Amino acid sequence: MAIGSLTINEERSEIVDFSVPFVETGISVMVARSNVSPSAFLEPYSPAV
Amino acid sequence: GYGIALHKGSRWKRPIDLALLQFLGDDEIEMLERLWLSGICHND
Amino acid sequence: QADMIVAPLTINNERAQYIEFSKPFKYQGLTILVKKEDSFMQ
Numbered sequence: 041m042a043i044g045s046l047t048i049n050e051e052r053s054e055i056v057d058f059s060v061p062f063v064e065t066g067i068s069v070m071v072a073r074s075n076v077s078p079s080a081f082l083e084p085y086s087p088a089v
Numbered sequence: 090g091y092g093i094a095l096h097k098g099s100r101w102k103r104p105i106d107l108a109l110l111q112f113l114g115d116d117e118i119e120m121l122e123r124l125w126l127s128g129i130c131h132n133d
Numbered sequence: 134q135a136d137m138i139v140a141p142l143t144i145n146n147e148r149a150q151y152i153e154f155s156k157p158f159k160y161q162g163l164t165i166l167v168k169k170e171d172s173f174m175q
Contacts, residue, residue, distance in 0.1 A: 041099075048092045057097050060113075061092050
């Protein structure tokens, strides 16, 4: 057995038999944090009143 | 998703699947992640 | 009378012994859906 943070693929699943997945995992990108709470015309009840 | 590699002939695949599918059922797996992956300072 | 089931079929331990499943298309979960719901002089 090979337990750990292994991820299912196509080449690996060809030559070995994986179990049922139990943690989701994909591809992601991480960035920093950007540096208002607006109201266009302050819209009391929209352009109705 | 993640998984467990085997011997391609281990025949332990079946005894693991039913055991693992139970922990995904009601309260077992849905409790471990609170103990380890439960960090703070999330999005706002 | 059938050989495959191409439909939304949840993977369950109870029904994993009589028939065998495959790798899922997409991952999901269970949620709850509920409904939602003279401005002066009150």
